[PDB]
Amino acid sequence: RRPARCYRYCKNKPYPKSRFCRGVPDAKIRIFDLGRKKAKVDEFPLCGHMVSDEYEQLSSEALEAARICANKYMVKSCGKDGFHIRVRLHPFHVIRINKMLSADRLQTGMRGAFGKPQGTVARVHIGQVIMSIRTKLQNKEHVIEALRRAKFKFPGRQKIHISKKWGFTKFNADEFEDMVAEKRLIPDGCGVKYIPNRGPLDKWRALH
Amino acid sequence: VKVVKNKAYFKRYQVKFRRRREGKTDYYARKRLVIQDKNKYNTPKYRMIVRVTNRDIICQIAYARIEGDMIVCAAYAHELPKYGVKVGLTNYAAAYCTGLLLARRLLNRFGMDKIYEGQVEVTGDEYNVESIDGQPGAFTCYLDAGLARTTTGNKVFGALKGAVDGGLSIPHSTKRFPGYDSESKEFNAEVHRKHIMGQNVADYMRYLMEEDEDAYKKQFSQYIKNSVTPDMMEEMYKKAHAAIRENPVYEKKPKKEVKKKRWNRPKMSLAQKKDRVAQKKASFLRAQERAAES
Amino acid sequence: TNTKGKRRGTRYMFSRPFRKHGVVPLATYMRIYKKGDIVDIKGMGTVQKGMPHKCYHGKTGRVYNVTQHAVGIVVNKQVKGKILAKRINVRIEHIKHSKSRDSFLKRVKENDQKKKEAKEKGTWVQLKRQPAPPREAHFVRTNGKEPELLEPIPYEF
Amino acid sequence: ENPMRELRIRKLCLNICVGESGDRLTRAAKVLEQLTGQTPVFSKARYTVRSFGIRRNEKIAVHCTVRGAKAEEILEKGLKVREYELRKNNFSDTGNFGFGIQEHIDLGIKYDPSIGIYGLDFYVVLGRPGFSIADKKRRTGCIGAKHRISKEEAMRWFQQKYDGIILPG
Amino acid sequence: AKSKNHTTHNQSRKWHRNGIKKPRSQRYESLKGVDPKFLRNMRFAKKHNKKGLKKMQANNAKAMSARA
RNA sequence: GUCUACGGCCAUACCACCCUGAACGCGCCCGAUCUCGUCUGAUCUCGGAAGCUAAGCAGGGUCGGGCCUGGUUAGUACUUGGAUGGGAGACCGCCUGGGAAUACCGGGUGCUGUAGGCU
RNA sequence: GUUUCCGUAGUGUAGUGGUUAUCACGUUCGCCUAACACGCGAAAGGUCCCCGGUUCGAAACCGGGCGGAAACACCA
RNA sequence: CCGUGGAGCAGAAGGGCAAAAGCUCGCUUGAUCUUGAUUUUCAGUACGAAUACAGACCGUGAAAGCGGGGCCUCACGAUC
RNA sequence: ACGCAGUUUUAUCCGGUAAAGCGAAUGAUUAGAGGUCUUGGGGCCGAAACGAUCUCAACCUAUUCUCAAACUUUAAAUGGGUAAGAAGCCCGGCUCGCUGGCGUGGAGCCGGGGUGGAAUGCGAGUGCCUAGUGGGCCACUUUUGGUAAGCAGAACUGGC
Ligand SMILES: [Mg+2]
Ligand SMILES: [Mg+2]
Ligand SMILES: [Mg+2]
Ligand SMILES: [Mg+2]
Ligand SMILES: [Mg+2]
Ligand SMILES: [Mg+2]
Ligand SMILES: [Mg+2]
Ligand SMILES: [Mg+2]
Ligand SMILES: [Mg+2]
Ligand SMILES: [Mg+2]
Ligand SMILES: [Mg+2]
Ligand SMILES: [Mg+2]
Ligand SMILES: [Mg+2]
Ligand SMILES: [Mg+2]
Ligand SMILES: [Mg+2]
Ligand SMILES: [Mg+2]
Ligand SMILES: [Mg+2]
Ligand SMILES: [Mg+2]
Ligand SMILES: [Mg+2]
Ligand SMILES: [Mg+2]
Ligand SMILES: [Mg+2]
Ligand SMILES: [Mg+2]
């Protein structure tokens, strides 16, 4: 386990786990949702998300420790099934290690220069969302404090933003309450199906 | 619930071709039939297109340009009662007859009638058309089979033999004409002449008259509705070939106009389509208001 | 050290693009390739018998020889020393015309027509292609409405 | 009220899948010759088993296709053996049905002791006038939705002709 | 004792030191490399032009000079 | 206003389902004695013409799926050239120029050449 | 660390020149014996290291890991 | 019945291919002899490989045409 | 007057990188919902019963999260080739053993008529002989290996 000071801002092309890598071990994170996974859309109105500022690489172990800290503060503040946290970020870039000393100069110079896979990190663009927590209206400050506790644990500088959208959907919270009732949006689990008007008439007849 | 039938199949479906989806071309043989070698730069390559359809055969000569295909001459089977062959429009005799009419009409269009008489006395031999020095050269055309399987006895070869005896210098072999034996490699010109004149179906009409008069009246009906007897068929095609070779000029039809026209239904407009949708919306809302209460 | 074989960089270049696979169209063949025709080179993936090279894709040359079912084109290829006129034999499926010479012949025909009109009527024509001139002292119109005032917007994430 | 859209017998398939090649397979071909009056045609691999001793490219099955009045006669013999009692899962969704029989001497064959008892598959497809479009070489067109033969059409045809019983159990 | 392997630096400048040249001068293009059947056309056409062009072209030039 | 034969552009013209088709034509169909090739006249060939538009086919329709085109995305993401611009870096801002795409929305869905025939 | 080789019933192995579960010891049952050793006849016992790709078909051909066995690791 | 390439084309991949370059069947050795040109690597030298021609003798096909090895990218060798 | 250009414009073709996308093919990958053919774990109606009920399993449908140097429908900026005339147009005629329905096509040859045919800059073309060189380095930018290096290796331009 090498420090995160030597694996930082992007200096290589993305090298994913594929047909040509074949040697990367398992990532640290395996799951990506921690809260009420079966939460409906009208249950938790708002969401606060965590916006990066530096074009950096976040490691999977950092994502692990941050989601554990955020989950722990959420279950100590609003308890189980009072929140829904989703790590938006998924690690795919495989960093490499060129290890030596396997106190001698008589084993290997820079002869075999290409390295073996060490672990998985995640290339993060400027403005790309790290995490997103949807909660009730009364849990506004708790999401702020949870992502603030994750802020001290991610490297680099990043900000927090309470979204204008209604949860994880791409539609506005101002338009949601006035527009899901009349015509368009129908809830489908935790996601929302948006229907256009360019359908067959059997869909409109199945509605109403 | 089972299959993933058609999701992006329509979006990645490379359509083949208009004529291939209609099923009228192949293009793997058309790319070799049509395209002239480029040491000529303008010389058209003439193709006799012989298409057999139910009730009618079509014999044409065409070449190609970048805009489409240019047809110089064309002869049909429904024009044979103008030459004498009233009934039997798709027999091998009509194939030979349409090929002869096509060749005579092409040579009448080109003015090469007095020269290149061809094979007047129909014998069924291997009469290759030779060119004469000091005179305009022979017409070099090539066959088109289309999608028909060219086994021995196909009447596209009968139209070929009609064009060759009319005087079109088309290269051909004698091992796909009817009457060619398969085991013995020799060719039977008497059987080929018999099959041109149509004496085999004369023998089959004799067979039906001597075996089953009920079948002889069930099929072959229009024959005895006007008149068909085998000696008059043997004289009938013999006079029809002479009528073609004496008058191939193809008189046409006037066809001014008949100024009365409504058969097909035109399209409806965008506003009409949208108002159909609006009437459907209003009628469904009216039904949901009315029938749920009543 | 790149193992410079034939077509070692042609994963995308000699490929039929999208929704255009299958048999070759016949209007590619049915073209008039005389001598002096300024023609382009664009390689094909269907016909493998006449690929020019990976270096001559997209270039433009002059026809010197025509055969049964190919053509001969002289192409200026740039090498380390200096550009060279090279004599290539390319089949017909890989070749289309160039319309720049056709536009120049259209301009020559228009200039001959204007010169005929000039000799007829004594009218000066200015048949030289002058480039895009500076804008003249034209006169704008602002009737009916005042000009709309634009201001930059505040920053919102 | 129904212009020339008649549910007629298109063909009748006859199949015997012998577990080996040689004497029993040749005698099964002899049985199909005794039914049809014409020679059968053999089958082969695209599988290699190793559970009972056959290999790739061996004569596993014999089969034949009978069309016309002979097909109607052999269909009558098969429904006479089964006594006109099919089952509801015999009819396929494409309008075709098969049933199969054992004890081939029930078809009207004098039992030779050297041949033995071979079972025989009977598979019938239903045809309408206008099904040669999907088989002719020139213009292979589709059939259509209102013209294709379905499950209900096939079972109502079998209720109408030959006086059959569905046995829905 | 490892050395620098390969580069193309300071190469285009050496190319443009002497002014990269089009061949730029081919009037009456070179005739070799053309179809021998077309050569059997053209050479026999040229030598029978040398033989039998005299009197018809001479009288035609006299006719067009008299009409011009 | 159409169709047939050969086509050019290759989905504005493919796929699913439902209606319409007067007259030539296309077809389904009607049988193996010759030419023919098959286990099977099912496919391919041979002389038909008793019915039929049920199918192909040709039109129209689906708040149809796809395809083409136009707005939006967006003067955004990118980007030639420049600075003794900012910042520890990460990168970002400015001058001069060029400028894309998915979502979202709207419209169309064949055009024609040659030869021939129907109203 | 590098280069070769191996992994198969509880144990040591054979077997690919692709399409088996092979031998020997051990266990259980029964016999000979008064009873044991010895001997006999059967039976059970296999993830052919684990996970993937090639094909009609893999343990076999190949790859990534796992655990081992040999050889080298020298001059300053 | 659905089935636009999701199979196959000798092998490592890329490209390409559907009345096909794929599978099956029937005949055949054009995988023949010979002089030049051109492309590739390149110094515009050679070998190797390839392309379009030309002249004989042929194969197939009804003919159009196709074929002087393998659908293309490699699978090979100077003086004496 | 001809000609030339590390330049631009006007047209004309070429590409598949940045970007973007994967509710689009290939490859990965997250979560919830709806549907019911399927075999497999449970208890429940109960002599057993695809006679019937709930859930998990898997599949399908419509969504949704995140990517791809060896993925891609789309597709830049930058860049590459070509043309911008008198060596070019147009007319009339001879030759051909090439080709061929045709004085058909195509090449060659002869004669005649009209140069004011994008911007800016510049006087060009060509022959011979030969030294030195064949150890490089640095910088803005685009980049490969490496944690990084005043490290090693590439591209354009400039400099030592
Ligand atoms: Mg063919
Ligand atoms: Mg060096
Ligand atoms: Mg017979
Ligand atoms: Mg026969
Ligand atoms: Mg029949
Ligand atoms: Mg119809
Ligand atoms: Mg109808
Ligand atoms: Mg339509
Ligand atoms: Mg639509
Ligand atoms: Mg900059
Ligand atoms: Mg089908
Ligand atoms: Mg491949
Ligand atoms: Mg491919
Ligand atoms: Mg073929
Ligand atoms: Mg030859
Ligand atoms: Mg590339
Ligand atoms: Mg990218
Ligand atoms: Mg010196
Ligand atoms: Mg030195
Ligand atoms: Mg360096
Ligand atoms: Mg150094
Ligand atoms: Mg200096």
Token representation of residue B56: 């009618």
The answer to whether B188 touches B128, Cβ cutoff 8 Å, is no
At residue C152, the 3 state secondary structure works out as: coil
Q: For C77, phi and psi rounded to 5 degrees?
A: -105, 135
**Residues of E contacting chain C (CB within 8 angstroms):** 6, 11, 15, 20-23, 26, 29, 33-35, 38
Length, in residues, of chain D: 169
**Residues of B contacting chain C (CB within 8 angstroms):** 12, 14-17, 27-28, 30-31, 34-35, 37-39, 41-42, 64-66
d(CA B278, CA B271): 10
C30 — contact with chain B (CB < 8 Å)? yes
Q: Which of B19, B26, B65 is nearest to B145 (CA)?
A: B26
Chain D residue numbers touching B149 (CB-CB < 8 A): 137
From its phi and psi, is residue B36 left (phi > 0), alpha (psi between -120 and 50) or beta?
beta
C155 touches strand I (CB under 7 A): no
Chain C residue numbers touching E38 (CB-CB < 8 A): 65
From its phi and psi, is residue A160 left (phi > 0), alpha (psi between -120 and 50) or beta?
beta
Please give, rounded to a whole number of angstroms, the shortest distance from the CA of B3 to a CA of chain A. Answer: 22
Token representation of residue A124: 């993060």
3-state SS record for chain B: CCCCCCCCCCCCCCCCCHHHHHCCCCCCCHHHHCCCCCCCCCCCCEEEEEEEECCEEEEEEEEECCCCEEEEEEEECCCHHHCCCCCCCCCHHHHHHHHHHHHHHHHHHHCCCCCCCCCCCCCCCCCCCCCCCCCCCCEEEEEECCCCCCCCCCCHHHHHHHHHHHCEECCCCCCCCCCCCCCCCCCCHHHHHHHHHCHHHHHHHHHHHHHCHHHHHHCCHHHHHHCCCHHHHHHHHHHHHHHHHHCCCCCCCCCCCCCCCCCCCCCCCHHHHHHHHHHHHHHHHHHHHHHHHC
For chain E, give percent helix, strand, coil, nearest 5: 55, 0, 45
Token representation of residue A78: 């609003």
User: Strand ranges (DSSP E) for D7-156?
Assistant: 8-17, 41-42, 61-66, 97-98, 121-127
- Cβ separation of D137 and B149 shorter than 8 Å? yes
- Amino acid whose CA is nearest the C1' of I12: C100
d(CA D10, CA D127): 4
d(CA C114, CA C102): 18
Give the H or E element holding residue A203.
helix A201-206
Chain B residue numbers touching D137 (CB-CB < 8 A): 147, 149
Token representation of residue D74: 């052999």
The answer to whether A119 touches A64, Cβ cutoff 8 Å, is no
Token representation of residue C139: 């006169």
Find the largest Cα–Cα distance for chain E: 89
Q: Which of D71, D21, D11 is nearest to D44 (CA)?
A: D21
d(CA B230, CA B236): 9
Token representation of residue B239: 């006079």
d(CA A133, CA B212): 93
Classify strands C70-77 and C95-97 as parallel, antiparallel or unpaired.
Answer: unpaired
Q: Is the dihedral of CA B84, B90, B94, B98 positive or negative?
A: positive
Q: Is A160 exposed, middle or buried (0-12, 13-18, 19+ CB in 10 A)?
A: middle
With CA atoms as reference, the chain A residue closest to B283 would be: A205
The answer to whether B177 touches B164, Cβ cutoff 8 Å, is no
Token representation of residue D102: 């054992």
At residue D81, the 3 state secondary structure works out as: helix
Q: Which of D90, D87, D96, D89 is nearest to D150 (CA)?
A: D96
Helices (H), chain D: 23-36, 69-81, 151-160
Give the H or E element holding residue A194.
strand A191-194
- Give the CA B11 to C1' I75 distance in Å: 19
Q: Which amino acid is at C60?
A: T
The answer to whether B119 touches B104, Cβ cutoff 8 Å, is no
At residue E52, the 3 state secondary structure works out as: helix
d(CA D117, CA A171): 74
At residue A119, the 3 state secondary structure works out as: strand
CA angle A116/A117/A121 to nearest 5° reads 150
- Transcribe C37-104 into DSSP letters: -EEEE---SS--TT---SSSTT-EEEEEEE-SSEEEEEEEE--SS--EEEEEEEEGGGEEE-SHHHHH
At residue E1, the 3 state secondary structure works out as: coil
Q: How many helices (H) and strands (E) does chain C have?
A: 1, 5
User: How far, in whole angstroms, is CA D131 from its chain's centroid?
Assistant: 18
Q: Which of B86, B87, B103 is nearest to B50 (CA)?
A: B103
Which nucleotide has the shortest C1'-to-CA distance from C89? Answer: H52
d(CA D97, CA D10): 12
User: In this structure, how many other beta carbons lie within 10 angstroms of the beta carbon of residue E42?
Assistant: 13
Measure Cα distances from C90 to B5, C38, C56 in Å.
43, 14, 10
C48 touches strand H (CB under 7 A): yes
Q: Which nucleotides of I are covered by protein (CB under 7 A)?
A: 3-6, 9-17, 23-25, 27-33, 35-37, 59-74, 79-85, 87-89, 92-112, 114, 116-119, 125-126, 135-138, 143-149, 152-159
User: How far, in whole angstroms, is CA D123 from its chain's centroid?
Assistant: 2
d(CA A119, CA A28): 9
Rounded to the nearest angstrom, the distance between the alpha carbon of E11 and the centre of ligand 10 is 26
Q: Which nucleotides of F are covered by protein (CB under 7 A)?
A: 1-2, 4-11, 13-20, 22-30, 33-37, 39-68, 89-92, 104-119
Q: How many helices (H) and strands (E) does chain D have?
A: 3, 5
E35 — contact with chain B (CB < 8 Å)? yes
B38 touches strand F (CB under 7 A): no
Where does chain B break, by residue before each gap (C–N > 2.5 Å)?
Answer: none
Token representation of residue D39: 């020679």
Q: Which amino acid is at A91?
A: P
Token representation of residue B273: 């389509």
| Entry resolution (Å) | 3.6
The answer to whether D119 touches D16, Cβ cutoff 8 Å, is yes
CA angle B97/B98/B101 to nearest 5° reads 90
Which nucleotide has the shortest C1'-to-CA distance from B173? Answer: H62
Token representation of residue A180: 């899901």
Experimental determination technique: cryo-EM
Q: Which of E12, E18, E22 is nearest to C83 (CA)?
A: E22
Chain E residue numbers touching C67 (CB-CB < 8 A): 35
CA angle D139/B34/B174 to nearest 5° reads 80
3-state SS record for A45-95: CEEEEEEECCCEEEEHHHHHHHHHHHHHHHHHHCCCCCCEEEECCCCCEEE
- Cβ separation of A208 and B288 shorter than 8 Å? yes
Chains B and D touch (3+ CB pairs under 8 A): yes
A106 touches strand G (CB under 7 A): yes
Q: Which of B36, B31, B32, B75 is nearest to B57 (CA)?
A: B75
Measure Cα distances from B10 to B5, B13, B14, B284 in Å.
10, 5, 9, 32
Rounded to the nearest angstrom, the distance between the alpha carbon of C80 and the centre of ligand 20 is 25
d(CA C68, CA B37): 4
Beta bridge partners of A158: A52
d(CA D34, CA B22): 44
The answer to whether A133 touches A85, Cβ cutoff 8 Å, is yes
Rounded to the nearest angstrom, the distance between the alpha carbon of B272 and the centre of ligand 9 is 17
Residue A117 per-residue DSSP state: E
Chain B residue numbers touching C36 (CB-CB < 8 A): none
D56 touches strand G (CB under 7 A): yes
Which nucleotide has the shortest C1'-to-CA distance from D56? Answer: G56
- Cβ separation of A208 and B280 shorter than 8 Å? no
